[PDB]
Nucleic acid binder design. Structure first.
Ligand SMILES: [Mg+2]
Length: 1052
RNA sequence: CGAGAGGUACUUUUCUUUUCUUUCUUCUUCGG
RNA sequence: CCGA
């Protein structure tokens, strides 16, 4: 009953569409058929055995279905059989009243504090199709001959009104729409088996704004002027968030805001003066980009004259309160009347940097503000022009990922197909080339990081008087010796990691050791991928600024364009020594910084891990017990204190000294202590949710740690040594079969482990590596580093999908329940041929590589198609459709390195999803594999003091509404109970705000210690004043009418 | 009996399923 | 947000 398009099962193949049209109009009524389409295998001379017919109403569709079920449709000795189609031939609503024809559409925004409306442009004679089934509305705006489809979804509309232009309340002739996001703009571009009854033989492509004055990009409010709205109120009541009230308006003249730049929603800084500060104007413009202050409410002189002469802190704390409230403030003058050093010091201690984040849509721009992000190397060596850095990302109108059809649309012209670049392509290229111009500044393309390329983000810098965009680029190094287009861009994002700086090593302290390599059977291999050597004391001097008591044996390090780990030798003689396979460019700096050193974090059992280990003769029955042993201590965590220590000592951090571990041993029951009872309940809800969503079966006998190679020569092909550290449960039973307590903290292994990587798809990635013991290996002090053999045939890191040794993880486990004795041969490791140019990079090929990284990026579908093609097909991970996908994954993960795309073919998509997915829109099917059993196994389980308190309250309650958190536990833990529209489809963008709220509340915990030491410096007398802080949050008599917080006094 | 002319006489003699693809715009995976 |  949703659609009227009917698919006929058996039509004759000797007919034309007119013969079927006349037959259907002879049996049914006259001209009751809207669309008719017979698909052809060839171009125009080979029709197929079925056809699609779309009727005008539902009654004639039901009558045709009743005639077909009674066998009364005989067309040339063929009984027609009707069924249901997949979609409409033309996206047209089947309603005679919803198709509003020849109406007036005008755009604008409320100008003054009242409910007025200023019009920029006016469109006369447009269409209006309200698609209830597809949950969108579309307009057809004709301009200069061609038309432009403007698609507006239902989720973008937040307020539907009923206005009146003519003044009379009974003459309802206007409908005001309030759009949170922007609309999708389309364009019409320019025979025998299609009748179609109208002019619909064209195609829609996503282009930029069509108006010469560019009014649509600053048109967050709409006004649908209808001819006569009397019975249309029953149709407009189906719109979401429809306020059932009649309200008048005033049509203000608004042709003043007429810009010609690509960045439309910006205030004219030349009119208000170039002497305005950037810190206030950027926040005032970001409030305009949000749905709090309109354009005319901020561009008036009564707001600039009252905000120009003031201090910069006082004018910012009253502008942050405008973003604090969720109500749309119509009069900003009335709010600021009721509203009335450390930043440079706080960057080198906790890597706190406030960067201006932007979101570029195909229509407008969305500036957010100086958000707290992790400071990298470049902004820490450039801590004087922090207001010139900007993170720019290219997203959709609803802040989602840009697909491959919004730009570079394919069109078969001539003999072969050719991709056609639309107006979004030339817009993103113009933005990357020229730049954006907000305030008295202009942001130029600096570079982009390795993860910025996958997330479609880029770094931008403004050329000031001191430095420029070229000087900061040549300060990193010289990139003229790289003749590639992808590698020259990838080496400019190498020096952008989230690191902590250390002392500078001079240029005289270099020692180049000649490397080692093996060439077996014509295949080139190497053992010194990114490894190096370091001394005993140098680890102490590099750990003196990080606070590491336990000396790590291997840690990833970077300086001067070199990348990889370094190992500790006990026969060291110099301070620093380097290999030759670290050089990427000839830099001119040698400042040292460390990203992440070493951590003995226990592992989990991922989906591809089960997919690759349920093939080698290991049974599927133990995978349910491996999660049953976890849920037996996870389920009774809410009502017991014994399982609460075991489910927190190794779940999130092994030696994790946090607030949940100090009150775990010397603590009470979870019935009392609500500060413990809240976070433990939300950790239980997190542990069930991230187990139901993805496979995260925890095992205590396995770890995850960074590996390195050692210069000993004893280790051979097939034998390593694992000197793991003893956890809180490893010291309870030292006498084990495969484990051996060599010391108190160091618990070595004597069994056999499996070593793989985090992405793995080929069955040759599984390899058995026996842990042996030697006195020369135990005397070298290889703590928290799985060492690798020096010689052999090929290196064992390279056996795990061609992995190098440059600061990457390794999944290891010495469990003895599996049967890994069956072994498969490995796959190839050499990628595609590199592409070298005959000239130098002119800084436009990097723009082309960044824009063409969005298209032809099928990395998101290969791991999905492999996981479904291993569920639906027996002899999984060994069929040909698994080997082609395993080759395409290794070709697609090198797309950031070399410029060779993946090109995911057709007849390989599954078109059917298993049970263990969150895709509730696809026609799914019940999975019979072990993954469906593991998905059902969790469904079987789920069946003086007052001033400080009041200032902590107002310092904490703002970021809940600012981030979208409804409670304190959503923002103080990391995981929010509610999700947004674009965050429900992007895990990487969800992790951004997940880390960003923790990095935000870290500074709140810093100022909670700062105010505590500002109140009293004595520690022995602080326990008597902390009792009052506990009593005002525990006792109900000291609780005021506001919602007080219980996580306030728990600072230590 | 040899030469020159015209005539009967190789006719399809090996094409392969006739069911082969357009219902399209869709979550990379891991750890801080 | 960052590193395979
Ligand atoms: Mg690596």
């Amino acid at each position: 009953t949703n659609r009227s398009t009917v698919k006929i099962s058996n039509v004759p193949q000797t007919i034309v569409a007119d013969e079927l049209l006349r037959f259907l109009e002879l049996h049914l009524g006259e001209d009751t058929v809207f669309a008719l389409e017979i698909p052809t295998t060839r171009d125009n001379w080979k029709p197929r055995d079925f056809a699609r017919v779309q009727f005008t109403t539902l009654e004639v569709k039901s009558r045709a279905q009743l005639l077909s079920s009674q066998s009364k449709l005989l067309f040339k000795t063929h009984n027609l059989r009707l069924s249901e189609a997949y979609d409409d031939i033309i996206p047209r609503p089947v309603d005679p009243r919803k198709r509003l024809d020849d109406i007036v559409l005008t755009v604008g925004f409320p100008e003054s504090d009242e409910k007025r409306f200023c019009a920029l442009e006016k469109w006369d004679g447009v269409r209006c199709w309200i698609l209830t089934e597809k949950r969108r509305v579309e307009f057809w705006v004709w301009e200069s001959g061609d038309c432009y489809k403007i698609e507006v979804r239902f989720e973008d509309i937040i307020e539907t009104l009923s206005c009146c232009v003519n003044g009379d309340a009974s003459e309802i002739d206007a409908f005001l729409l309030k759009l949170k996001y922007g609309p999708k703009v389309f364009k019409r571009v320019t025979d025998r088996y299609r009748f179609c009854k109208e002019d619909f033989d064209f195609m829609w492509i996503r282009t930029t704004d069509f108006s010469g004055s560019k009014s649509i990009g600053t048109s967050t409010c709409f006004c649908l002027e209808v001819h006569n709205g009397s019975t249309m109120l029953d149709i407009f009541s189906g719109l979401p968030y429809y306020r059932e009230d009649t309200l008048s308006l005033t049509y203000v003249d608004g042709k003043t805001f007429a810009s010609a730049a690509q960045i439309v929603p910006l205030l004219n800084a030349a009119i208000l003066g170039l002497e305005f500060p950037y810190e206030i104007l950027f926040q005032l413009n970001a409030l305009v980009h949000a749905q709090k202050i309109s354009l005319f409410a901020a561009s008036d002189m009564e707001l600039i004259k009252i905000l120009r002469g003031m201090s910069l802190e006082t004018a910012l704390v009253i502008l942050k309160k405008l973003h604090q409230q969720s109500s749309i403030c119509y009069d900003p003058v009335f709010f600021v009347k009721t509203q009335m050093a450390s930043a440079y010091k706080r960057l080198t201690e906790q890597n706190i940097m406030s960067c201006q984040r932007a979101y570029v849509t195909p229509s407008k721009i969305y500036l957010l503000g100086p958000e707290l992000e992790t400071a990298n190397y470049v902004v820490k060596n450039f801590a004087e022009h922090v207001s010139d850095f900007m993170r720019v990302t290219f997203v959709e109108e609803d802040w989602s990922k840009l697909p491959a059809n919004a730009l570079s649309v394919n069109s078969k012209e001539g003999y072969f197909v050719k991709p056609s670049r639309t107006n979004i392509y030339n817009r993103v290229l113009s933005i990357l080339g020229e730049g954006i111009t907000v305030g008295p500044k202009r942001f130029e393309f600096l570079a982009f990081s390795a993860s910025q390329l996958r997330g479609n983000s880029v770094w931008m810098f403004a050329s000031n008087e001191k430095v420029k965009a070229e000087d900061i680029r040549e300060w990193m190094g010289c990139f003229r010796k790289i003749r590639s287009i992808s590698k020259c861009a990838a080496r400019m994002g190498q020096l952008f990691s989230a690191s902590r700086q250390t002392l500078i090593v001079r240029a005289q302290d270099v020692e180049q050791i000649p490397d080692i390599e093996v060439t077996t059977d014509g295949a080139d291999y190497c053992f010194s991928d990114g490894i190096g050597k370091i001394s005993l004391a140098f680890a102490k001097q590099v750990a003196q600024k990080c606070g590491l008591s336990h000396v790590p044996s291997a840690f990833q390090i970077r300086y001067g364009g070199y990348k990889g780990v370094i190992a500790v030798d006990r026969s060291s003689f110099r301070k620093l020594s380097l290999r030759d396979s670290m050089l990427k460019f000839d830099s001119n700096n040698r400042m040292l910084n460390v990203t992440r050193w070493t951590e003995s974090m226990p592992c989990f059992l991922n989906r591809e891990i089960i997919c690759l280990l349920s093939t080698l003769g290991i049974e599927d029955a133990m995978f349910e017990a491996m999660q049953a042993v976890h849920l037996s201590m996870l389920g009774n965590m809410l009502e017991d204190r014994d399982a609460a220590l075991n489910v927190l000592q190794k779940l999130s951090g092994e030696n994790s000294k946090n607030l949940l571990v100090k009150m775990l041993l010397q603590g009470y029951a979870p019935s009392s202590e609500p500060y413990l009872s809240m976070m433990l309940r939300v950790h239980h809800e997190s542990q069930l949710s991230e187990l139901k969503s993805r496979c995260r079966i925890l095992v205590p006998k396995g770890r995850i740690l960074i590996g390195c190679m050692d210069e000993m020569g004893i280790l051979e092909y097939g034998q390593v040594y694992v000197r793991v550290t003893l956890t809180k449960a490893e010291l309870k039973s030292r006498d084990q079969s495969y484990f051996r307590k060599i010391d108190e903290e160091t618990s070595v292994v004597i069994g056999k482990v499996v070593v793989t990587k985090n992405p793995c798809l080929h069955p040759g990635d599984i390899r058995v590596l026996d842990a042996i013991y030697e006195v020369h290996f135990e005397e070298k002090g290889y703590l928290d580093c799985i060492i690798f053999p020096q010689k052999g045939e090929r290196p064992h890191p390279n056996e795990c999908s061609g992995g190098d040794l440059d600061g990457d993880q390794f999944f290891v486990s010495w469990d003895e329940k599996i049967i890994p004795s069956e072994m498969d041969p490995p796959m190839d490791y050499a990628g595609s041929r590199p592409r070298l140019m005959d000239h130098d990079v002119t800084l436009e090929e990097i723009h082309k590589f960044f824009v063409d990284y969005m298209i032809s990026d099928t990395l998101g579908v290969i791991s999905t198609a492999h996981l479904v093609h291993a569920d639906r097909d027996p002899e999984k991970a060994r069929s040909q459709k698994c080997l082609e996908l395993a080759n395409l994954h290794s070709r697609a993960v090198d797309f950031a390195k070399t410029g060779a795309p993946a090109e995911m073919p057709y007849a390989l998509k599954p078109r059917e999803f298993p049970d263990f997915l969150e895709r509730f829109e696809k026609p799914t099917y019940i999975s019979e594999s072990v993954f469906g059993k593991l998905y059902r196994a969790v469904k079987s389980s789920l069946a003086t003091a007052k001033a400080h308190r009041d200032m902590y309250g107002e310092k904490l309650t703002s970021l809940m509404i600012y981030y979208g958190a409804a409670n304190e536990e959503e923002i103080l833990t990391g995981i929010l109970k509610t999700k947004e529209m674009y965050l429900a489809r992007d895990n990487r963008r969800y992790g951004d705000m997940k880390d960003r709220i923790t990095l935000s509340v870290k500074d709140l915990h810093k100022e909670a210690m700062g105010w505590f030491e500002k109140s009293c410096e004595d520690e022995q007398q602080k326990k008597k004043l902390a009792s009052a802080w506990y009593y005002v949050t525990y006792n109900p008599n000291h609780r005021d009418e506001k919602l007080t917080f219980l996580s306030f006094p728990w600072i230590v």
